[PDB]
Amino acid sequence: PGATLCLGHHAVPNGTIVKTITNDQIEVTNATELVQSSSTGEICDSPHQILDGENCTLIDALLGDPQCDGFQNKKWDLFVERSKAYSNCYPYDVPDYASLRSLVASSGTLEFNNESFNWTGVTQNGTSSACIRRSNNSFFSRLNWLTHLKFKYPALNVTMPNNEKFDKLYIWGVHHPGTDNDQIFPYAQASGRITVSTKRSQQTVIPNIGSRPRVRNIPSRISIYWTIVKPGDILLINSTGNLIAPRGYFKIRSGKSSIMRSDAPIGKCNSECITPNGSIPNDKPFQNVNRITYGACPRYVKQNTLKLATGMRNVPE
Amino acid sequence: PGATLCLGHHAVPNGTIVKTITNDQIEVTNATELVQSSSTGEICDSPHQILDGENCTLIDALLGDPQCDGFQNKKWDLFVERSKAYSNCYPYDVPDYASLRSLVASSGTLEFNNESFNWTGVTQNGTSSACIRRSNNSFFSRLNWLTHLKFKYPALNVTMPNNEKFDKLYIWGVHHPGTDNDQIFPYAQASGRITVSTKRSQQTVIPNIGSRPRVRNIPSRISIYWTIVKPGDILLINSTGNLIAPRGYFKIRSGKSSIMRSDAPIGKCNSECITPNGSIPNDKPFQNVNRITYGACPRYVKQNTLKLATGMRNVPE
Amino acid sequence: PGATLCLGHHAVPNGTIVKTITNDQIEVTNATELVQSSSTGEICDSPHQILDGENCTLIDALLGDPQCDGFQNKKWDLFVERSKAYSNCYPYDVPDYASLRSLVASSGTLEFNNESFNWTGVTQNGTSSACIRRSNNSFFSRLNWLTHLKFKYPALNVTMPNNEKFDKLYIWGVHHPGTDNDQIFPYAQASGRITVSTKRSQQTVIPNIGSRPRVRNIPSRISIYWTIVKPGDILLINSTGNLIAPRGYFKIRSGKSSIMRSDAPIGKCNSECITPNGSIPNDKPFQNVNRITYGACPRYVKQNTLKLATGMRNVPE
Amino acid sequence: GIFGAIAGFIENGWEGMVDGWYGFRHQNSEGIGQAADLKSTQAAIDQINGKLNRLIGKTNEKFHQIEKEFSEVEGRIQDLEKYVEDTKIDLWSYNAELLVALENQHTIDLTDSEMNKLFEKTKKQLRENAEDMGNGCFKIYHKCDNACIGSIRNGTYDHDVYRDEALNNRFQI
Amino acid sequence: GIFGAIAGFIENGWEGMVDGWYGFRHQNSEGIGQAADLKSTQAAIDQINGKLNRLIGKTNEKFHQIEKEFSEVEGRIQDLEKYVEDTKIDLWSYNAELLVALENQHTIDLTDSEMNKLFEKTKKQLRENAEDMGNGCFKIYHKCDNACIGSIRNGTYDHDVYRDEALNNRFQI
Amino acid sequence: GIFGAIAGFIENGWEGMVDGWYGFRHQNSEGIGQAADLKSTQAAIDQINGKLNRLIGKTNEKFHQIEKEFSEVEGRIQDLEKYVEDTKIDLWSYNAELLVALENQHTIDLTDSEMNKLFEKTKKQLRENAEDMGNGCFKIYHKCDNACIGSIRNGTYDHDVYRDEALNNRFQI
């Protein structure tokens, strides 16, 4: 009689369809998903240092809007800005807002050092009803609104050397009055000029008198500027009025920090990859959750599924 | 005697040469071209909505140069600018011309809504011999050149709320006079200032008196600016002279519109892919006609031919 | 007895490990390196035309700082800027420095043509102790510091047509005085204004009086601007003071020129690929020496080694 | 597919083989049996694990990048930011699509290869004692009990022991 | 190339086979004939059509982009626009070159595979009734008329019917 | 790996074969010899040289680009310059990694293929005069001196000359 010996291979009742170079649908015994397509919906608070902005934008926390006093000197890996944030101080604009937001975000710190500027000849600490701190009229905590002393505002010519190892970031501003009265009451003279300079740079700004639509009842504006001063360089501030002076400098660091816009809640959990939709697992090489990511993340692709065969062709009985 | 049975394969007298991983020239029985390298030389008028600029740039049609009156309120998928275009109105410049051209191009509409600004105290509708419309002196149709009323030009402080669902685009300008006479005749006073503002933004511009090389006999210039006003925000225009006022706003849309520079004729035909050289077929995955494309187009590559084998190796008898 | 016939293949005692799709370490008989990871440390002077900046930045050589007089009218493929470079003339800044540096670098020439501007009414050739040329007080060689003639500085209104085939590049400047005295001594009047224009463009600049930190004992500054004038266009300079005038124009070319920051020595040798670390061989398709390259260069990758198998699997006895 | 065993000369797979990917079925005097071949099974699995090792858990860290959503119209710089991102995403999407298509074609081919290699090895082992029937089965021309079949599966079968019996059965009239 | 049939042990192709890609020529008592094998032919064609389905008519829509030609010198922003575009084009040009080279190597290999598979299937069908001559031809050791050849081409040949005749012819002295 | 010869049914390579990549060892009445096969050797080498021709000495010229190092903090434009470059480098690094992995898998497979093709060609040449032992060796069932072995290596061996001797030795009891 003899014998029969048959060579063969397994099969499964429930195969999965994959794509190949020659066939868009071929059934294999098993496959695995290469595109991460879901999130829990929370931003995990570990292992990255998360700073929830709550009601505050980064720029508001920088300038020192009263609601942002809790942010002083804080550090982050990722600053999270919420869509409910709003400003509640003197109305302002920042020419090239996006750049200042970016450079502070990537620096990753609000560390601020007070300096004693020689402001002799003027009244310091000007305040406004549009910027309430603890029921009192107030102002941005990091800024010093200078006004007349006994109806004179003499020329200011003030210097501050950088003897540190690091770059200093100075934030400052110009007051644009709504009317003639808004120029006379604080400075009691026709017109101001501001020149802020270093060995390597200069910025001059002229106040422009004129009505702007009222914001929290104020038709004036502050325009915010910045100046980086290198080690061994010197800051020079030369003003005849309308100067919103710095109280000191921010430390500028380099490292891995950033900023993200998200309304996802922060959770107590541990995930390396953050998206605005929430943290996502990072086992897969690709993802279609969000193009915006932070951390050790899969690469964003347009496909919502890509199946890698992990078994042979399935040829059921 | 028995038999002989031979296995074999076909061959052709006229094979084609392809490239492989191991050989730069191997002959196969058949191949197909993957790089589109020709055009008919016409831009097909279907299925995209084409707007031929003819003598007009997009910016001229926007401002309302007299030769561009036929463009009022038109829409496009693709605006086509011709190298023969020329301006024939008051000479002007647009700081960041390229951005305004871009944002209007992608909006895809010249839809304009007139608004009634309260211009009491000045003479409206100023005109010039450098801008002829129907034999008469005229001006840009979308702009309102304000001048003195009885040798006075009082301060203007005019407001316009945005109560719409969409962003409004305001185009406006400043007149820079060529001489002292070009300042006195229209405004009859020393110097103008313009501040255009919203809750979120402000732009101030000062006229600068001075001779520029004459263009169509005019040594003055207009400088063109723009302001986007969001729903619920308010436009504020504050001027003491030299204001080229808006007559209303443009609708700003988002969608798939763009602009292309081309001298190709428009034809009556149907093609999904437009290049400046003409429409091209889009059956192939790649093309070397032009890096500039619009529509469902093959991807631009540097190679002028890439042949995909569609048959076996050719081994002739 | 018969015979035995065995088929086989070679092997080597010293195989090399490569990566594959299915195995991260498999031994083959031979392999070759695809990533260039070393340099000699010199920039080869052939076959590209190298211009060693030595103590001079490109911008200093352009303006004509005294130490850079040897650079007049030179051409380069690659301009090499050294970290020891320093300025030794009147202190200056260039708004958008990086753009001017770039456009001159890519033009690849310092070819300068003198022009005779009609400067009647003023004193030409102003000089300074901060800019010593051959023991004498001097100035930037390509710039003309205009001052009063007999305590008057009349309005200047000067024209220069472009009748050439090429674009002309004009470099010019404004003097910002440190004090009132620095305005009176040179111009002997309150304030200057500069408008530089063409048929297609205009730039106006106002001097701003104010103390800046002293650089080589000078608290004033020059701000440098540029203007390109097309064939058939005309340059117009209109000033009432503080103008640092051009002496002519630079030719602007297009071609393959660039600029690189490097402290590597220039050697007498021949290499097509330059990096800031030195020239590198270009036999390999990839390199991990520097992302900055010039010439026929391997493509920068992050890996420091990638081994291509050039033999079979090694299966030792 | 490329070797012709799986979905080729082997008509179908075996749903009842649950302890390996490749194996042997036999019929002899003592009945009909099945056993998995662990070495071919492990060869295929090790290759697939090699691919997975190159794809799973290998992500890159990125930190501060560019903005990718915008609330205002801005023109030229914004157009460039958007185009850079769109360009990047299309290039990665292409990479991902091609990677999976190529890897899957290769997985199908390497699994077919392992089947073919096992078949070939078994054929050579049997020498003149069996004939290939064309469907992955050998007709063995001698009495081949459970220990004999085991010997073939373990690579220890001595063809000389049965050659006289087999030749006599094969080359009969 | 990788299987060794096309441009290998098959000396050359047949220009006179115009109704299929693979096939059979024979010589027997009734003459010399040729017939295409439709199943191998269709197997190769279906795979090539699979590639074409992934390459032809699959383009992406793009609309507003960045500018890519410039009439003025501008410096930094323009340098960046140009570099982004040049970067993109080089990356796509690379993708295109590699795609075609890989696909072509694979097409050559899969077509060789189909030839080899047909040869192997035919060899197994003939059992002990034929010997392989090494050039893609079998010497069949029995009378094999047109219907018999047809039976081999249609997969219906019963080797047992001819085995006695063939063994006697083969193993003669 | 995919054909099963190299690191498969051929147990190991030969360190003493220094004049070719593939070859023959024999044992006969006149001793034990070794000779390289130049045609298989050249086939493998030509394919590898084809890859090298596509990779070595093929660089692209670039000239003025964007800046890639910065001494000052600047924000938005600088962020974009850095991101463009980082994007480019990651995409090229990916291309390089994948290229080498794919090419190496293919080199290993094509070299295994050439070994298999030589084995198959030799097997077919010997017809009924030899049997495959399963380890890349044939048992030849006739007296086969140095000239006879040479004939097999040169593709000139006439199997009919020895067939009677071989059949008688093979099919003995």
Ligand SMILES: *[C@@H]1O[C@H](CO)[C@@H](O[C@@H]2O[C@H](CO)[C@@H](O[C@@H]3O[C@H](CO[C@H]4O[C@H](CO)[C@@H](O)[C@H](O)[C@@H]4O)[C@@H](O)[C@H](O[C@H]4O[C@H](CO)[C@@H](O)[C@H](O)[C@@H]4O)[C@@H]3O)[C@H](O)[C@H]2NC(C)=O)[C@H](O)[C@H]1NC(C)=O
């Ligand atoms: C179809 O194909 C896939 C891929 O080949 C198979 O899925 C794999 O299955 C194995 C074995 O079950 C899994 O191994 C286990 O991984 C666990 C970690 O899982 C998480 O993390 C990984 C990232 O590394 C993610 O991919 C995954 O989704 C999870 O989020 C370990 O915890 C397990 O360890 C267990 O055993 C060891 C002892 O050996 C112990 O040390 C542990 O304590 C624990 O008990 C284990 O290693 C593997 O994760 C799966 N891979 C993938 C990509 O999913 C399917 O099994 C296969 N299907 C069939 C039917 O065969």
Ligand SMILES: *[C@@H]1O[C@H](CO)[C@@H](O[C@@H]2O[C@H](CO)[C@@H](O[C@@H]3O[C@H](CO[C@H]4O[C@H](CO)[C@@H](O)[C@H](O)[C@@H]4O)[C@@H](O)[C@H](O[C@H]4O[C@H](CO)[C@@H](O)[C@H](O)[C@@H]4O)[C@@H]3O)[C@H](O)[C@H]2NC(C)=O)[C@H](O)[C@H]1NC(C)=O
């Ligand atoms: C060498 O290799 C190539 C690719 O394998 C072969 O070219 C293909 O040939 C087939 C058959 O002739 C072509 O099929 C026909 O396509 C027509 C549409 O053509 C246009 O559009 C496609 C995009 O989809 C473009 O690629 C192409 O260039 C054209 O611009 C259809 O109209 C045809 O349909 C006909 O038959 C059907 C019935 O089956 C009817 O419905 C129709 O009314 C009509 O009568 C047909 O489908 C195919 O387009 C070609 N592909 C390519 C990429 O070119 C060569 O034939 C081959 N050479 C040899 C000698 O074999």
Ligand SMILES: *[C@@H]1O[C@H](CO)[C@@H](O[C@@H]2O[C@H](CO)[C@@H](O[C@@H]3O[C@H](CO[C@H]4O[C@H](CO)[C@@H](O)[C@H](O)[C@@H]4O)[C@@H](O)[C@H](O[C@H]4O[C@H](CO)[C@@H](O)[C@H](O)[C@@H]4O)[C@@H]3O)[C@H](O)[C@H]2NC(C)=O)[C@H](O)[C@H]1NC(C)=O
């Ligand atoms: C392991 O694998 C590699 C790649 O297959 C082999 O390396 C190759 O070896 C050959 C032969 O020795 C080399 O060929 C020689 O190239 C020289 C030029 O070398 C430089 O330039 C190339 C770029 O083109 C660089 O890749 C290389 O690193 C060098 O910088 C020629 O000058 C040689 O020519 C000689 O012979 C000819 C006559 O045939 C004469 O015209 C010449 O005058 C001269 O005498 C020669 O062509 C080749 O460069 C190597 N390639 C690579 C990529 O390195 C190893 O040999 C191999 N190892 C083993 C043990 O086999």
Ligand SMILES: CC(=O)N[C@H]1[C@H]([C@H](O)[C@H](O)CO)O[C@@](OC[C@H]2O[C@@H](O)[C@H](O)[C@@H](O)[C@H]2O)(C(=O)O)C[C@@H]1O
């Ligand atoms: C430093 C200083 O002068 N603070 C003043 C401030 C400024 O003079 C003014 O904002 C400059 O533009 O003015 C404050 O009052 C004016 C303010 O009064 C409110 O009641 C009203 O709502 C506003 O429209 C405006 O008239 C201020 O609070 O801003 C007082 C402050 O001490």
Ligand SMILES: CC(=O)N[C@H]1[C@H]([C@H](O)[C@H](O)CO)O[C@@](OC[C@H]2O[C@@H](O)[C@H](O)[C@@H](O)[C@H]2O)(C(=O)O)C[C@@H]1O
């Ligand atoms: C609104 C208005 O004032 N329109 C005037 C216009 C302006 O005053 C002037 O352009 C402001 O710079 O001047 C017009 O005339 C002056 C013009 O006369 C031409 O003949 C000559 O070609 C020019 O050089 C210039 O002198 C004008 O047309 O521009 C009259 C217009 O009503």
Ligand SMILES: CC(=O)N[C@H]1[C@H]([C@H](O)[C@H](O)CO)O[C@@](OC[C@H]2O[C@@H](O)[C@H](O)[C@@H](O)[C@H]2O)(C(=O)O)C[C@@H]1O
């Ligand atoms: C063209 C001209 O006026 N040249 C003067 C120059 C300018 O007036 C001045 O730089 C404008 O700001 O002044 C020079 O002297 C003043 C200079 O004197 C030095 O001794 C001192 O070190 C400086 O602080 C300053 O007071 C000059 O060299 O700059 C003379 C020059 O002729």
Ligand SMILES: *[C@@H]1O[C@H](CO)[C@@H](O[C@@H]2O[C@H](CO)[C@@H](O)[C@H](O)[C@H]2NC(C)=O)[C@H](O)[C@H]1NC(C)=O
């Ligand atoms: C310029 O016009 C605006 C709008 O009419 C004036 O602003 C309004 O002032 C009233 C009180 O006078 C406030 O109650 C409104 O809230 C203001 N509206 C806005 C939109 O700000 C403005 O006062 C005018 N300026 C001058 C100097 O007359």
Ligand SMILES: *[C@@H]1O[C@H](CO)[C@@H](O[C@@H]2O[C@H](CO)[C@@H](O)[C@H](O)[C@H]2NC(C)=O)[C@H](O)[C@H]1NC(C)=O
């Ligand atoms: C400044 O100079 C320019 C050039 O000389 C003067 O412009 C010319 O004026 C004449 C009439 O006076 C015209 O015919 C020319 O067409 C003008 N040329 C150019 C290039 O515009 C200009 O008038 C002078 N300005 C002053 C205020 O005197």
Ligand SMILES: *[C@@H]1O[C@H](CO)[C@@H](O[C@@H]2O[C@H](CO)[C@@H](O)[C@H](O)[C@H]2NC(C)=O)[C@H](O)[C@H]1NC(C)=O
């Ligand atoms: C404004 O302040 C600066 C700093 O005190 C003054 O500049 C110094 O002037 C002295 C001589 O008066 C020089 O020796 C120093 O080198 C200068 N220092 C710097 C940092 O420049 C400047 O003179 C003051 N300006 C005015 C107009 O009083």
Ligand SMILES: *[C@@H]1O[C@H](CO)[C@@H](O)[C@H](O)[C@H]1NC(C)=O
């Ligand atoms: C098939 O079913 C088993 C058991 O339910 C499951 O574990 C496996 O993942 C499934 N496989 C596929 C390919 O769906």
Ligand SMILES: *[C@@H]1O[C@H](CO)[C@@H](O)[C@H](O)[C@H]1NC(C)=O
């Ligand atoms: C944020 O503002 C909202 C709205 O006014 C308020 O209800 C909430 O208490 C504020 N939260 C914090 C943390 O200040």
Ligand SMILES: *[C@@H]1O[C@H](CO)[C@@H](O)[C@H](O)[C@H]1NC(C)=O
């Ligand atoms: C700077 O301060 C000095 C010294 O008081 C003064 O002379 C000068 O006018 C000031 N300049 C400005 C622009 O405020």
Ligand SMILES: *[C@@H]1O[C@H](CO)[C@@H](O)[C@H](O)[C@H]1NC(C)=O
């Ligand atoms: C993540 O958030 C974005 C917001 O733009 C949304 O469009 C996207 O679909 C979300 N994805 C998932 C998986 O929730």
Ligand SMILES: *[C@@H]1O[C@H](CO)[C@@H](O)[C@H](O)[C@H]1NC(C)=O
């Ligand atoms: C060969 O010739 C035929 C008939 O003229 C033609 O249809 C076919 O496209 C040609 N093939 C090649 C590869 O050139």
Ligand SMILES: *[C@@H]1O[C@H](CO)[C@@H](O)[C@H](O)[C@H]1NC(C)=O
């Ligand atoms: C465009 O301008 C040219 C040149 O002046 C003229 O001949 C033509 O009629 C104009 N076309 C239109 C459509 O206005």
Ligand SMILES: *[C@@H]1O[C@H](CO)[C@@H](O)[C@H](O)[C@H]1NC(C)=O
């Ligand atoms: C704005 O208009 C108001 C009201 O007429 C006036 O007081 C003010 O000076 C104007 N400002 C400007 C800059 O024109």
